[PDB]
Symmetry: D2
Subunit: 484 residues, 4 copies
């Protein structure tokens, strides 16, 4: 077999014994194989993601199947176009080897390696989120994560924060339902959550929501099943997916879009760009199908180093003015400059399948081969012209610069409708899980949280208020003042 | 209450809404509060420890109680001397938020903030280790850790490695016994593993092993109890410890030493500086007592950032020539330069309780206030004399520089001793756990592993061979050729 | 006091490594050798991407006027005295580059105010070369040494600048003798952009800041530059540190130029264009600064200071100048990298008021947190905002867009500047610019010369001769340019 | 080709940021503005702790002797052609520091051999100032600019060197005109230390390496230094890059001086003392190097190359020189920080042979691993060692120790050097040392003078004059110094 070498290519003569000053003597500083193997070892780890640290990556392909040229000019949506993908599924709060049975929303991020560049659709199984403005994301994550004093879960903290956040009511209803503990990533849907802005070749815009429909169906664990699985397997989602792909049982999802024109936004009773809302009566249209059929070759180089970011957009796809999405356009590229580095987008899993041509340079571990003296634009010696067809869409403005919440909140209606859509057994599990989680919250926050659940549906609030030992008369009088 | 501020101290006007271009417009880049909060958030995480990433830190005090001036000049051992400590307990292989029920050795690292500087005793509950030379450490960890292709446990990998490592037999016997799954950190002992060299005021040396004897007793979980605990609690060791301290029930450990003179080592049939060995008949002497009685204030600032390293030594305590230990003198300080930074030892939790006076300077995030022009030694303007009493001890040398295994291995005797010391019930649990783990290893490595167990004790090897489905006749013939 | 390791243990020998016998190899277990070398091996951090070469000093600012109608900031309250940290610098070259190299010179002032830290990061030139921060990286890459060799190559800047008529004014300032100061004490400081001051009623004013040197202005001419460089590559640092050591403390008066929001539309140029001065707006004195103390340690203080236009206090906000808007992001961003997440907690960067927020962890966090409340809002440990500190509201119209400003006036002020120079000052300018332009590609060179010609026919004509451009092509090119 | 963003998407407008209307603020969603500024903000990495100012060129080495009796290394096989990367540098000052400043000049060569990459990291000076690596951080700290002001302050290095008599020989080379070369092309290079060469029979030889310039040696005297500095702060880079552009490729012959292990105890000095040359050992030529190609990109190649004495191939090992021993640790260590754990996988650092080991992960890992076997040994995917590559064995005796070498001889070789200088060179040497020593504290100054006086009474006497030392004290201190 080929000889073991050091990183400079030199063969190693003994990989079992350190060089010592005699049989009973100390180790020498000059043993370069010892030093190099330990300095590499000592530097293998990089920071985990600040959220969604626990994840599983797989590869597959997406094939478009409809004519949506009237909605978007992006080549990924052209009927019959087959684009390779990289998908990273994940939980949200806990560290990287945390039990996959822990209750949480699950991430569903798809990197499309399109012919116009890489587009990332960074979604979750839940179609709505807990907040509507990215300025609260650091606050929200800090409240959800383990207590900073102990590294132990302490749910009284998320309910202190969330008692000030009535808009979280619908998504907390998902979290504490059995949708919070899936049986496999193959048995969950995916949603973009926000409305994205699709732009056609005439410069016209449509606001669109994306949904991945599982062709395997939806399968969740109930709290007693969660405990049985957790007893022997702390990686059941990863085992399920990797194992399925090894057996050739490739999971698939159909992609659907819901569409609104800019002039329809103001007609609704809720704000269509509020990330805490679904669009209940807008029809869905199928535009493609993705199949995930290949495992990764190396977890660290692919799954750990993949950089998913809503900022990775192609002409024809832009962010909407959803205020949650707006901060996401900054945050992922920013964190990835730190987690990976300035040259993170040049790693194999992050590279586009098209040419990159710009003046960005240098930075740590630059692996390029540059020969030109022109790293500026414009240049008449080595021009790099822009493409006028790729200019951003123009959105009309009015009012003033401002710091004010959106005007139509409707914080409790959709939560109530979701609660009522649940089977009797689903409601029972949601009520017992939410109540157990809320039981030792401070009394003031506890009765305020329970007022939101009661305003969503009196049966929901009454039952969680019994489990959590809240004060039902205070819950009802607080709920009476809440506005629809 | 005090107004929320930005990091430059300027008060914040609205922490709930980002600044937007009208009520329906996009978010502005000039919103410095949004951008600061997101950039700080985006940079919260640092690399986890390459091993022992899952850990719990607490604080307490150690009080010495014997006259060991004959063995060491170090102040921490002076009778009645009280020294504050920081202890970090941990598992080894998996990451943060991995289940604390996972089978593994457990770390027991004590930072003593002595009156002569900080001394770290970085030990484990197991008194022996799997390998005896630090050049194999990276290989050993890579074999134990989850498969690099999938991030899932795959014990065929560790047994392909350990089939070439007959010296791992005794510690794999501890690993697969119920000592591999403790009921609490308070119910385990701690050991230095290596002999350390204590030096007295005359410059004379003694080799000593350290043992923390639990005053709460030893309590382990058997396989069925592990699954039951894991079903509901993935942080059972942290909860147990933080819990006890909150209730005032402070865990204690008596510190004992085993002592051998330099001239006695050659008389043993095993090498006393072999990390795979205990010293079976050397008497123990109690030298002090440690009580852990305070939880940390902030997990990140203290438990995550603490830097435990065998290199943090004080005059009177030095590393022995144990070849595993020698590598550890280099590796912890090296990985901390990366994980923390060049200024990592100036963080609050890592600072000594005595003055630091040297020419080490600059480096990222230097928080000092230097006024001198003298950052070199020697200097006649601002001298920094050495202390001739702190010169290292002189060890006699013989032979040549070399790369060769130690001359006495005795790889199976102590492992058989350990097996035979176990109760019938403990034997059954060991055999079932080891055999289930080994069952899908490649046949050649599996029968070689079994031969090691059979040579330790024929009953051990026969029973694990039945559970693992190895070939007994091949096991017996391979064992017949093994040497004692 | 005895020499120690970083753990506080005393060192027994700091002159000899531990070796295996008199003729033998060095031992891995010598922890003093390893810890000194590992710290030494990690002393350096990335230099600033621009302005790497700099000098820092400390002093104090005292406000002297009632400007409460313009800003509610406590720093400007007449009589208020505020400690300052100032960093002066060059722009293009590395940290030990000669201080005589031709460049704009930075003048950044960190005010440790009673409302928090406010940084006024300006330059001695009152105008900049570009007017939209999206071009900053390109501009800097064209100015810096050639990426192939690390050697100055002025044809690269004129290839870029031939597309940028808006750089005419400041290029005139660069190639003049103001491009090579005699001391930092002998130069003015300008904020360049208009900032928006907001008073206690919420009213806004657009203001320009100017530091007037009370030592006067003193530039070196070309011949004096080579003379000084021959023996001194740190002449600016030497002058300032030496002057403070002798007790000759340099002082600057701070002046403001003021405009109301409804006045911006009435000029022939865009008042928020960073390549423009405000020629006819009167100046008012609002305070004075004295720099009277040298630093204790260059690295801890001068190298680690983090100056950023985003360090704002109530009463001061960015204007819509498109150059400034980019700077509000870039400084804080690069400091997260060059220093780290906890860079603003280093001694030189800390404010003199408490910091109260949920920002946490990050590399080398030196705090002492005990609370479980790292989120807002909380009813257990609230951290209320102050409604009085809400940002001002600017009226908007039109659409989101990617389009240059409409009033450019790229040559007029460039010409006024040229013609304002003495005959000798003009001669030096023409020769420095023309020598720098000489080997630019012919198309860029004659386009550059057209911008100078459009500014002032004598200017363009004299540089064309030195630089060897085609006078007739310059004149026809200039014919097609708009004032 | 069309400009793109880093994800490959085409840019529609690289001239204007996206704003909220023509007079409105910039938008956070303009991903091109943010990605360009984020990349620009992170361009710089930490400069080398020493030798930050450098120039890199490429070339080829051709072996021309049969030295298989001394080393089994393929690089030295007669007729063997190996590609090289060479980086020349100054030592003490930061990037863009004047290349005329007085220092030793680095001469590092990376040989991309058929057995792996071998780096010969040398200098023009054949000796060094100190002899144990434990003092290296102290020495560098004393040599660099004062930590309080970032200005050169030569009193600091003499405070330090007044305790270091062994630096006399190299301080003599430093203050001579060898300290200011006219080009890297006109300077020799030396490995300084003895290296251990090992042949195919396991036999060892101690060897010194010397690169003989085939352009001759060309220095600048103090008056010429000032002239070049007045106008050129990159004279060495210019000279070397320009020479190669013209086709005038510089050449160096490689020579070795050989000693057997039993010969080291014979001499009156220690042959592994880095402050010593080997005066009477003869030199044999073993090959020639020609540098004939410039780099394509300065940052990717010259800034990112990783030169380290730890990059060894079979046939070559460190000797027991105590300064060399620390260098085996420190270069790889600083490169783990300056570059990263994956720094040896960058294009310029990669070997021309396959790398096969279980080193993995780390920041920005660009590999394409498929195996699950990242440990050794393995019976599934074995990675056997080669017994012929085992390290050589050195006989030991004594005990572990912290004690200076015994045969110091700190002054004789320095005096020898001085006496070989022409009258011109002696006067230049004397004026510079004296001028640098001038404001040192009297006690250190007179002790430095004693060392010079002990090397040679005229040296001592002539430098004590310029520096204003006290000759009677110098002579009585010198009286007591031993040979
Ligand atoms: C609709 C709401 C959101 C969804 C669906 C979502 C989804 C996700 C997913 C799936 C990932 C993991 C991607 C991967 O597998 O690598 C992730 C990571 C992340 N998210 Fe979000 N998230 C949302 C809200 C936010 C917000 C509001 C912010 C901040 C402004 C944010 C910041 C981050 C960060 C910093 C990471 C780590 C990325 C990395 O290190 O590569 N997210 N998110
Ligand atoms: C007797 C054998 C060993 C014992 C008892 C042991 C114990 C420990 C413990 C208790 C910790 C965690 C300290 C904490 O809580 O921060 C640790 C971490 C670590 N150990 Fe060991 N270990 C052993 C062998 C080794 C060897 C041979 C090496 C390498 C030569 C090594 C390298 C490391 C590293 C790099 C870390 C991470 C340190 C950090 O990031 O702060 N260990 N070990």
């Amino acid at each position: 077999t080929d000889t073991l070498t050091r990183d400079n290519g030199a063969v190693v003569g003994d990989n079992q014994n350190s060089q010592t000053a005699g049989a009973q003597g100390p180790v020498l500083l000059q043993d370069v194989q010892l030093l190099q193997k330990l300095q590499r070892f000592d530097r293998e780890r990089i920071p985990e993601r600040v959220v969604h640290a626990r994840g599983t990556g797989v590869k597959g392909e997406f094939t478009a199947s409809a004519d949506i040229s009237d909605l978007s000019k992006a080549t990924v949506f052209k009927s019959g176009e087959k684009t390779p993908v990289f998908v990273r599924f994940s939980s949200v709060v806990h560290g990287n080897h945390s039990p996959e049975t822990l209750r949480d929303p699950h991430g569903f991020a798809t990197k499309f390696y399109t012919a116009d560049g890489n587009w990332d659709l960074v979604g979750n199984n839940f179609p709505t989120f807990f907040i509507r403005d990215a300025i609260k994301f650091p606050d929200m994550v800090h409240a959800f994560k383990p207590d900073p004093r102990t590294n132990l879960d302490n749910d009284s903290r998320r309910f202190d924060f969330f008692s000030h956040v009535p808009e979280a009511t619908r998504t907390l209803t998902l979290l504490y339902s059995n949708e919070g503990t899936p049986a496999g990533y193959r048995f969950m849907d995916g949603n973009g959550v926000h409305a994205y802005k699709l732009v056609n070749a005439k410069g016209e815009v449509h606001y669109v929501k994306f949904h991945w429909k599982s062709l395997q169906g939806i399968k969740n664990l109930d709290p007693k099943e969660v405990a049985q699985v957790q007893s022997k397997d702390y990686s059941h989602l990863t085992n399920d997916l990797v194992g399925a792909i090894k057996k050739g049982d490739f999971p698939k999802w159909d992609l659907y879009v819901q569409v609104l024109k800019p002039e329809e936004l103001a007609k609704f009773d809720f704000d269509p760009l509020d990330a805490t809302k679904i669009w209940p009566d807008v029809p869905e249209k199928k535009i493609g199908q993705m199949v995930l059929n290949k495992n990764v070759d190396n977890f660290f180089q692919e799954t750990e180093q993949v950089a998913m970011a809503p900022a990775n957009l192609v002409p024809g796809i832009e962010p909407s003015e959803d205020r949650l999405l707006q901060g996401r356009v900054f945050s992922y590229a920013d964190t990835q400059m730190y987690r990976l580095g300035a040259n993170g987008l040049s790693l194999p899993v992050n590279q586009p399948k098209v040419a990159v041509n710009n003046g960005n340079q240098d930075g740590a571990l630059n692996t390029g081969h540059t020969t030109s003296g022109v790293n500026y634009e414009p240049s008449r010696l080595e021009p790099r012209p822009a493409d006028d067809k790729a200019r951003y869409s123009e959105l009309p403005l009015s009012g003033t610069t401002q710091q004010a919440k959106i005007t139509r909140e409707q914080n409790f209606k959709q939560a109530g409708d979701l609660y009522r859509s649940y089977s009797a057994k689903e409601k029972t599990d949601l009520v017992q899980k939410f109540g157990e989680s809320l039981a030792d919250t401070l009394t003031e926050s506890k009765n305020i949280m329970l007022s939101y659940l009661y305003k969503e549906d009196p049966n929901y609030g009454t039952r969680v208020a019994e489990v959590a030992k809240g004060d039902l008369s205070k819950v009802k009088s607080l709920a009476a003042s809440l506005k629809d």
